[PDB]
Symmetry: D2
Amino acid sequence: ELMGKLDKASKLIDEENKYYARSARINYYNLVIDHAHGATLVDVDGNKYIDLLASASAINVGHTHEKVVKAIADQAQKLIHYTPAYFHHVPGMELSEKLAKIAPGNSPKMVSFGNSGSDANDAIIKFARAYTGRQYIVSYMGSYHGSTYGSQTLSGSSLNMTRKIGPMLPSVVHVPYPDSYRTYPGETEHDVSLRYFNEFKKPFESFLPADETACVLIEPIQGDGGIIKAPEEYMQLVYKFCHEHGILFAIDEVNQGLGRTGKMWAIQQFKDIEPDLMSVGKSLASGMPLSAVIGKKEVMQSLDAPAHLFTTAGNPVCSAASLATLDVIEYEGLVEKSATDGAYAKQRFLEMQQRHPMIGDVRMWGLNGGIELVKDPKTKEPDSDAATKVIYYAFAHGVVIITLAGNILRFQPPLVIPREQLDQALQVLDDAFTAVENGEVTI
Amino acid sequence: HMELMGKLDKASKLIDEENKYYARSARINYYNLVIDHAHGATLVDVDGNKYIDLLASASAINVGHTHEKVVKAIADQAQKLIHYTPAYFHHVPGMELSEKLAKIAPGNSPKMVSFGNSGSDANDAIIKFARAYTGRQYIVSYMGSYHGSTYGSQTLSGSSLNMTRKIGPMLPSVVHVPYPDSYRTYPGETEHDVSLRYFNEFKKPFESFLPADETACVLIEPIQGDGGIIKAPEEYMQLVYKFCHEHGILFAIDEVNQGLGRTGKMWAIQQFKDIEPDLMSVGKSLASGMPLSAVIGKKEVMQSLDAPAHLFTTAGNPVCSAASLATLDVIEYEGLVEKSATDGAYAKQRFLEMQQRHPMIGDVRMWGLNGGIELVKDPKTKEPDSDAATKVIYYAFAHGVVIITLAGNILRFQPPLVIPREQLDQALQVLDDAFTAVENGEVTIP
Amino acid sequence: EGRHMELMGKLDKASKLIDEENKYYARSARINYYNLVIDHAHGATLVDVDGNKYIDLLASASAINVGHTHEKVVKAIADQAQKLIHYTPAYFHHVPGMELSEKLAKIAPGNSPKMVSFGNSGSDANDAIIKFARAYTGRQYIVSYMGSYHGSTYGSQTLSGSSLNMTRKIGPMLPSVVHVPYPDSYRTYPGETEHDVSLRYFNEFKKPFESFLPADETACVLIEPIQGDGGIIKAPEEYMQLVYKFCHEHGILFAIDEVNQGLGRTGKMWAIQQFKDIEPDLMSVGKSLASGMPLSAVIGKKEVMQSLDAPAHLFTTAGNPVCSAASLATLDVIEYEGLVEKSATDGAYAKQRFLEMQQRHPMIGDVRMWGLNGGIELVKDPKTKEPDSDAATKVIYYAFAHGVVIITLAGNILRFQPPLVIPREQLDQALQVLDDAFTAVENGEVTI
Amino acid sequence: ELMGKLDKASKLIDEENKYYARSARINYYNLVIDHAHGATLVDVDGNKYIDLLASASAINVGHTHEKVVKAIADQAQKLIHYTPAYFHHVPGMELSEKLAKIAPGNSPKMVSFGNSGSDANDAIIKFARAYTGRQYIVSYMGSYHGSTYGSQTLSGSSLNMTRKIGPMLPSVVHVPYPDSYRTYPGETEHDVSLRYFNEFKKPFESFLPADETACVLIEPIQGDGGIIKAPEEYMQLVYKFCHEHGILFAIDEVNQGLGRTGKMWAIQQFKDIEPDLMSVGKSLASGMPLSAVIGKKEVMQSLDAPAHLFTTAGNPVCSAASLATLDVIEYEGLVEKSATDGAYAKQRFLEMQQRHPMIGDVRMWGLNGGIELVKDPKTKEPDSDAATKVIYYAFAHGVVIITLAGNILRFQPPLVIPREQLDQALQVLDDAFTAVENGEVT
Ligand SMILES: *Cc1c(COP(=O)(O)O)cnc(C)c1O
Ligand SMILES: *Cc1c(COP(=O)(O)O)cnc(C)c1O
Ligand SMILES: *Cc1c(COP(=O)(O)O)cnc(C)c1O
Ligand SMILES: *Cc1c(COP(=O)(O)O)cnc(C)c1O
């Protein structure tokens, strides 16, 4: 009877499925969105929903923000596109300057635009190789960096990102990302840091010369990996190791940047780290396609054209949408709001944890959380069946939420989400856990 | 100098600042053009100078700048939904578009679509799908090709050494073959001789180290864009197509530059007889310069992967999809395919007549409103004359006409397909004047 | 100083010969320890061009399991050479190569039908394991280990993990290779048991498969059942069984490198026989196979060895008939002299001797021994386990100056691999020299 | 009858085929060799043959040469092996010094030993990369460089060297080797050279930066490709190109060195070319496993240990066999004999070609030839069926010969082959051409 409510959607999707490749979408629900605003979504059948996904953190300023809508409309009347690969336009020039300056740290930076976070990570590999003269790249297990052949190789969060499409880009080595939940009994944060740093070093102590490694790319908090934040001390060791060996230290801020964590950049959750290179995307232009690689000037001067460029990257309408997006973040104080509401949301989920033992771990840094569900607190066996039931319930009760790794609830609403609506959604999740416990949810 | 800094005062100041912040590898520089607004084939810079656009942002503006139908599609969609990722959910403009692209692609076999943001990423998808469907690893692409700037597409490319230097190793198991050149040919060669010679070169890796039975795909621009506006001969293309079918290698085309009416047919591959690709990449003009791309392939090939093998968060953005639907409406309603064909025939005649008076013009190549005017120091040696081409385009810019080069010495002719005959004639006279000026030593580049 | 001059006086012809060779022979082709120029040798005794003799505790890196210039091997070589020095098996056939390929198929571990292909080197047999694994499974990925040594051809060198100088300056290396950590039972976390070590290392093994590396696209795991160059480090039984079962569950071929540890070095014929009921899909053999004449083999289950057509894997001089004759002789010697049992017996005795040394010499942090095959790991402190390469270099230098040839692994580990024939009297003389060396180093008597 | 004469060999082979991988041999005949000497082979059934293959040019000094036999036996009694990867021995030291000096050109060289020509070509890749700091390698279609992952990637002579075993080594590019037989109507050698040099430049003009190319590896004459020699002018153009762009120029002398061509090194067939790197093998130790990479000293200093070394490489027995092999070449004048006997053989095969038009091209440099058989002299269509019948006939008449590329007879006897035996084998091949002409062979 939920299917009675999704009649136009179901019929649209059945036809879409005949034309649109199945590898292009991770399927959860029959949700065909007609319009949206803020944290509210409306489907083609008229159902309304609170967005706790923000399109995978691409909608930090909320849907259809009036400043961004106007920026897009106004720019499109003047110039829809001229490629910055050849020429110049004012929105692109203002934005590239602004990005260089608001990027973390005070060393002089330069920028190159792309369309996607994926291509910004391809760029990280190019610039690191060119600047250093070295070929090897280190990235993490559990990472997500995108879907172009460079970024895809770096990634480690899906087997379907490797199957059937190899050989991948050569000279990439994956190391394990610090997991602070499934630890050895008794380990402190210090023990975890040292153990993962020990694993980090083992390739460098065997087959991988540190002196031929161009860069380490790391998510300061892993997004698709499950909302997992590296310990402070682990990050400082990696940082120092890179500096000591002449390896560039690169970050991926595509998911966790632009105020998601309650600082501007996820890397600001750590003390005094300035990356050599960083990728930005997702929220940058409120979901219009735009990305950037930002790096220390000298690194960004290591390539000649046309080593890294795209016809529609730095599109003027996208750039205008991004200038408006950044202004909203600043004017509406969304970095601070993320920190405030994240602290609140954490406390709420931790209280839910006391009553709902299926909740193994609550990870939250700003309005940005992973709620991990396990069958048992000692074995920490993932309970994906429970998580699916929770999200299916939420969906049927007007709350859009998805999972990471099968058993982790992904919590990334628009940073603008009104308290009232955040509380409504949180109550719906409480109800969902209760309902699942009483076996009342049927897939 | 006083005169150019007079016309370009504000542009030069803005560019000097931009250069402190924007990486040099991100732009191929020709001239101090900062565009404020534009419409149809008219560009206006921030100083108020007006230009006729003979580049269409590298054939991304087939429908002309700020086409009202597209601008309205963008504003109206933006008010409803700027974005929700089709990597998780669904929206109507994207569903309408994906079905439409599946149907308008060349040939009658059932197709499916996957969106990206760039022609680059659609070429990476071609590798991924061809490898998954065939279970083979090797990819064959062309010298002189341009497929993009992601690690897959950039490996397949062959038009700039700066696309390989300092950044390898590149994607493994890619082999480059030479693209047929019908200008610098051996004495006495016919088109048949050229086709057979290039085909013989195509075969040599397959007769040596490259197993045809382990080759997933051959990727070809039916006409090379960045390579110089070079069209493969009919017979050569038929030979490769047949070779692919006989060995179970997917035959893939890149229509990112040459598609959507550029050549005077909807797809450049329709310049050849009865060829239906297994896979094809689309981009550039698809959404009037808004970032959108697609990989389109035979159904059974597109079913060979599971999620999330190929997807991007902002690909199939609803605003871009709305723009593309509007763009495809314009092409049809305004008969732009036919207009490119008629104006193409006309432009080729005008440039052939210019070649009679201006022997620096070695070769006039044109298929639709889509030409390469190749300049040379001597008609018999055919030695490239890049200095002359640079002077021509600099003269042109100073006289209100935006045009750039391919390979140093080839004038690139790709106006918006909507270009009014009156502006096309103005721009052609400017070029004619340009050739005269360079001939008389009246152009000196600072 | 006076002493150094004295030593160098006994090496006068050798030093002069080496100085000239250094003008023509590339530095990357040798890891230098001593001015040792061998004139002749027999058994475990080496004789240099200056007339000094030495007890061999290296056996040319376990290539001389049957001892030097074994009469039977010399005779095989000489008699074969008279008949046919070479005809390549890449085209034609000869009886010594036919006899030997059949014998190797049969003496390989396990009772599944096998086939063989010859190489010249342990390196090229490991390239072959990549080739055959990829071809049989239709999968591209190869998993090997940190700390491994598999050779110096581009495939085998990529799989390796024991020297940075095997990657520096020569990449890109062979693609689709992933390296995993090998179980270290010495430097462990406080209070870990062998069971804890086995689970922790297997957990690490699984991480790539749980991340970026599809098990269903992994052609093979290649493992040394005991790592040689990595330090004489044996995988725990439980770890090995986990990896073996994982491979079979996912259709990944399980391959072993026996080039160093095979042919009776561990006191079983094959080092994988140190484990319960494990039969490899593929294995590489080398080193001692032909008493140091260049020969190798890849040995695999029949259906794996049938996955390729000619000439996917062949070398003009592999399966040379003089090398083959040497190898048939060498295998006879192993059998007829009972060297597998002698390795085990002498290995047990040497282990006790080194354990008793360790009671008196706390610089000995770990004594690892499986057969006449040991790593004696020297450390600055028993609790920190910090490596003491300086102490180790001093020990082997003292040994060399006192008639015993022994080298190190990883800087700080004494490599103990004498020819398996070594007479007890000699084995005992060598052991006393090492005991003496420890004492000398403790008392500051050795200067490098 | 033919199978009657090979009773024991056939049963032996059936048995060996159960145990020895099929990928390890290219099968031609049921030939199981018992003993051999000079250019004479004797099988296990007692049949004798004249060797026109020399084990793929590994037996330049003839089988079981007394000097090599004695060197092997004398050295085995002293020391069978001690690895030069750690220590030293005199035969190895004398040989590395000697090879450094007899290699082509006057610049100071250094040497590193391997076991196989394959491993020496892997080393060319290593050293070129390490010395130049560049990654790309250029090699040729039609080439054969070996069966290790490096050398096998460089190779271009067999599809079964690529199938099923990829990905291969990355950053390798293949270019077409000049074909002087199947040319465009009217082409001169100058035209051939310039056209092939044009194709050589195409990758460097498109995707492959000459400034990131570490080396070009070339067979001065391609062996397995069909006995095909690059024109002089083409080689000079490549050589100059390499020097102008800082690319190492490397040669593979594994098949064509050690006197095979009638000069010591095949590259000496060209004017004043000194390679930066070169691979040596095959005949080096009379078929005992030994190889070398020889390069200009500064190139060979670019790597540290243990970047390239093998346990059994530079084995002292193989080393002694090599020293003796090199002495034979000098003391029996085998470089000149290959030149003189090669001129003689070329004239005989050219005279055969006048009477046997199935003979499309006669290529010969030294005692080293490719006799290419075609269905028609104008079309040049390959006739692998005629070549198969020729070599089968030969085998049945006491002459061992094989093919390259299906239709090219491979003519590489030991350089010592006595004139009586060379005339006898030439007449057998002339009879074979007749038999095949008359439809007498199946
Ligand atoms: C989403 C994401 C990307 C990829 O961005 P796309 O725009 O989908 O190409 C890269 N990195 C991280 C951490 C991400 O979450
Ligand atoms: C422009 C172009 C591409 C790449 O498109 P981007 O949108 O710049 O990634 C691909 N192929 C051809 C033929 C092109 O001209
Ligand atoms: C020595 C060794 C090899 C290499 O053998 P070479 O003959 O030197 O190529 C391979 N594997 C292991 C375990 C070794 O010890
Ligand atoms: C035979 C050959 C090789 C390989 O030598 P192996 O000893 O078989 O590895 C290399 N190059 C050439 C030109 C050859 O003829």
